[PDB]
Amino acid sequence: METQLQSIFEEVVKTEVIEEAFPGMFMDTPEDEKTKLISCLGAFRQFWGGLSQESHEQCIQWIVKFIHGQHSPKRISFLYDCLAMAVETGLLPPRLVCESLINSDTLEWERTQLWALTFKLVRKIIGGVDYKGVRDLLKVILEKILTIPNTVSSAVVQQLLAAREVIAYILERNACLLPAYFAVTEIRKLYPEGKL
Amino acid sequence: AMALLLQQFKENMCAFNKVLAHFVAMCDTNMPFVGLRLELSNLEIPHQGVQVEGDGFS
Amino acid sequence: WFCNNLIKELLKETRKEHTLRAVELLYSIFCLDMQQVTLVLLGHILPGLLTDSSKWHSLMDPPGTALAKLAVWCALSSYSSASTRQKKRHREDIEDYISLFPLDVNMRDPLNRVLANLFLLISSILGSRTAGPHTQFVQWFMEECVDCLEQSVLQFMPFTTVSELVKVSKVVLAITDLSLPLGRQVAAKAIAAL
Amino acid sequence: QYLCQPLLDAVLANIRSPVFNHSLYRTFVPAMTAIHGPPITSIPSVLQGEVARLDPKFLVNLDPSHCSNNGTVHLICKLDDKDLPSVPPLELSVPADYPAQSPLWIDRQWQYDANPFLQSVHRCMTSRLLQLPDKHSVTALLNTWAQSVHQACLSAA
Amino acid sequence: VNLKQAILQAWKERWSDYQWAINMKKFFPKGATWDILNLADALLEQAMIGPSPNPLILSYLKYAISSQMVSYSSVLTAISKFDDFSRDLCVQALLDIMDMFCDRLSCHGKAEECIGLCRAL
């Protein structure tokens, strides 16, 4: 079953070996981003509609560990666009994706492009979570931000700051994702009185 | 023996058929570099890819 | 001793409300001898907090924004320009500010020397690697230099800061430049290429 | 092993004594010194290597904007070739620790609109980018860019 | 030889914009960033002769802006020197050309080019 999803997603992003010898002579434009996304979304929709409810989440953990196992950032952003349209079309419940994205232990701050693209996608898809899920996401995002040192490199700081926009979006009072009392309760549980 | 893959090439006294001679020469001079690229990548020596070098004919 | 201990007692506050109140009080307390206090503050306390690698965990956002506000208020009020003990003691005092700040208008007036040295330090911090809380501090210092001014303390800013400040993230250019004919060239370079 | 074992047992028995090399000296140096006589009579340079070897089509220069002399570096290239048309300049973000990882192409979708031809350039370029192997160089990106421009010339006409 | 003759040959034999770019390169070995040779001026003169602009030479100018052949400063000056104003169609074409590069307006060059962009704005 994870073999099925393995064959699907690996057959999505295969790379051509014999190209760069006789470059561009093969008669075939490789599916550009939109057609490839539509085909990927269709095949994953087949596997998802086939899938059972209780098996709904271990496959998503496999998806996110397969995305975080990648190395090319274009590949990662393509599969994140796939996950974004898979949430946007209504196929996926928009809480499992966010939780398995953040609680993935491959998400460390040293993987700065993965950090930036991940928290960009969570900023995209957090608007649909119910408020208790937003509260638990707030807690795990704060605990993810808490692992950064006092000093980091001067180039990675802007890609690290992508979590700050998710935090600013959750604690924004006009957006009203959750009651603000819950937000200050989670914060003051993590930063009690006297802690910067 | 098994087939593995197939790709079609792009389109673009006449008894020579210059295009086929060109494709055969192109495969036979380019495809030695593909095995070298794989054997370099298995020992993780960073390299720019197989490139045309300076003039066109190399 | 006075200015250092009061700033230590600032920097161990953790609340936003108390830090802003402490700064609004400490300005008036430093108005006993504003000029000498600004020389100590922008010359000895702030370079020691920005240069020491162990110290800048004290420069976090709650006390740090307040401290940057107090430094820029002190700089402006000392530039634009008082008790009898303080008159006697500054008449007593001998120091060579040319020797203290060698630096790589008059520029023999010590406050211009302290300000030039501080802005060299700020450009060096913004230009370096290892961004931390001290970089947030010099960002805040330049932002309240922009906001607090009417137009000049920023006459002493090196023109490389114009480039670097938007490398580290409009009006913070167009105010900081002081608008000389060469100053437009650095302005138009930075504003168009944001 | 054979014919040499009791030496090995003695020396492996007597390791971690602080007077060990004293014992070896006292037991071995007079014999040897009697027989043998007395003793004896800013930018990481990988990127400079890439840029120094590029074809004169490309005209790679550093961005006036962006952080400089720090971890990652940023490039604005160009393209000069009579066969190829003038195209948007292209922006590259090379990480520090450049080999063992792949550089990133800063995407500017807005300038690759407003023409059909630049749209074809952009579609073909994203396609060849997806086709690329991992941990590719800068020159792989620049050559996929030039091949993308050439395909978008041919597909159009 | 002249830029007017090259643009006019580009109109005579129907050249698409990229073929115009290639043949414009070939006609002139020194690029001179194309602003010393005043590409925007010649293209605007021979585009704005009729009551409505011919879409060929407007396509040439829109390619020469979207591809970075011509700086925004020379375009904004050549737009500034048009007036006439009795024709709404040429004015709407000029406002679409301004709609292309405005809000972007980013010179990446010498500071004299940035001062030129200031005066052009």
Swiss-Prot record, chain A:
Which positions are tagged coiled coil? none
Location(s) in or outside the cell: Nucleus
Could you tell me what this protein does? Required for transcriptional activation subsequent to the assembly of the pre-initiation complex. Component of the Mediator complex, a coactivator involved in the regulated transcription of nearly all RNA polymerase II-dependent genes. Mediator functions as a bridge to convey information from gene-specific regulatory proteins to the basal RNA polymerase II transcription machinery.
Disease link: Intellectual developmental disorder, autosomal recessive 18, with or without epilepsy: A disorder characterized by significantly below average general intellectual functioning associated with impairments in adaptive behavior and manifested during the developmental period.
Q: How does it assemble?
A: Interacts with ELK1. Component of the Mediator complex, which is composed of MED1, MED4, MED6, MED7, MED8, MED9, MED10, MED11, MED12, MED13, MED13L, MED14, MED15, MED16, MED17, MED18, MED19, MED20, MED21, MED22, MED23, MED24, MED25, MED26, MED27, MED29, MED30, MED31, CCNC, CDK8 and CDC2L6/CDK11. The MED12, MED13, CCNC and CDK8 subunits form a distinct module termed the CDK8 module. Mediator containing the CDK8 module is less active than Mediator lacking this module in supporting transcriptional activation.
- What family is this protein classified in? Belongs to the Mediator complex subunit 23 family.
Which residues of the parent chain are present? 1 to 196 of 1368
UniProtKB/Swiss-Prot annotation, chain B:
- What is the stated purpose of this protein? Component of the Mediator complex, a coactivator involved in the regulated transcription of nearly all RNA polymerase II-dependent genes. Mediator functions as a bridge to convey information from gene-specific regulatory proteins to the basal RNA polymerase II transcription machinery. Mediator is recruited to promoters by direct interactions with regulatory proteins and serves as a scaffold for the assembly of a functional preinitiation complex with RNA polymerase II and the general transcription factors.
At the top level of its lineage, which domain of life is listed? Answer: Eukaryota
Instruction: Please report which protein family the annotation says this sequence is part of.
Output: Belongs to the Mediator complex subunit 14 family.
Entry protein name: Mediator of RNA polymerase II transcription subunit 14
Oligomer status and interactors: Interacts with GATA1. Component of the Mediator complex, which is composed of MED1, MED4, MED6, MED7, MED8, MED9, MED10, MED11, MED12, MED13, MED13L, MED14, MED15, MED16, MED17, MED18, MED19, MED20, MED21, MED22, MED23, MED24, MED25, MED26, MED27, MED29, MED30, MED31, CCNC, CDK8 and CDC2L6/CDK11. The MED12, MED13, CCNC and CDK8 subunits form a distinct module termed the CDK8 module. Mediator containing the CDK8 module is less active than Mediator lacking this module in supporting transcriptional activation.
Tissue specificity annotation: Ubiquitous.
Subcellular localization: Nucleus
Q: Which residues of the full protein are shown?
A: 583 to 679 of 1454
Tell me which species this is from: Homo sapiens (Human)
From Swiss-Prot, chain D:
Q: What tissues contain this protein?
A: Expressed in all tissues examined, including heart, brain, lung, spleen, thymus, pancreas, blood leukocyte and placenta. However, the level of expression varied, with highest expression in the placenta and peripheral blood and lowest in the pancreas and kidney.
Modification after translation is described as:
Ubiquitinated by TRIM11, leading to proteasomal degradation.
Query: What is the induction note for this entry?
Result: By 12-O-tetradecanoylphorbol-13-acetate (TPA).
**UniProt protein name:** Mediator of RNA polymerase II transcription subunit 15
Q: How does this chain assemble?
A: Component of the Mediator complex, which is composed of MED1, MED4, MED6, MED7, MED8, MED9, MED10, MED11, MED12, MED13, MED13L, MED14, MED15, MED16, MED17, MED18, MED19, MED20, MED21, MED22, MED23, MED24, MED25, MED26, MED27, MED29, MED30, MED31, CCNC, CDK8 and CDC2L6/CDK11. The MED12, MED13, CCNC and CDK8 subunits form a distinct module termed the CDK8 module. Mediator containing the CDK8 module is less active than Mediator lacking this module in supporting transcriptional activation.
Give the family, as the similarity comment puts it: Belongs to the Mediator complex subunit 15 family.
Per the record, the gene is: MED15
Coiled-coil region list? none
Q: Where in the cell is it found?
A: Cytoplasm; Nucleus
Swiss-Prot record, chain E:
Compartment list: Nucleus
Free-text function comment from the UniProt entry:
Component of the Mediator complex, a coactivator involved in the regulated transcription of nearly all RNA polymerase II-dependent genes. Mediator functions as a bridge to convey information from gene-specific regulatory proteins to the basal RNA polymerase II transcription machinery. Mediator is recruited to promoters by direct interactions with regulatory proteins and serves as a scaffold for the assembly of a functional preinitiation complex with RNA polymerase II and the general transcription factors.
Q: What is this protein called?
A: Mediator of RNA polymerase II transcription subunit 24
Tissue pattern of expression reads: Ubiquitous. Abundant in skeletal muscle, heart and placenta.
Where is the chain membrane-spanning?
A: none
User: Gene that codes for this?
Assistant: MED24
Share what the entry says about its subunit structure, partners included.
Component of the Mediator complex, which is composed of MED1, MED4, MED6, MED7, MED8, MED9, MED10, MED11, MED12, MED13, MED13L, MED14, MED15, MED16, MED17, MED18, MED19, MED20, MED21, MED22, MED23, MED24, MED25, MED26, MED27, MED29, MED30, MED31, CCNC, CDK8 and CDC2L6/CDK11. The MED12, MED13, CCNC and CDK8 subunits form a distinct module termed the CDK8 module. Mediator containing the CDK8 module is less active than Mediator lacking this module in supporting transcriptional activation.
- Report the family membership: Belongs to the Mediator complex subunit 24 family.
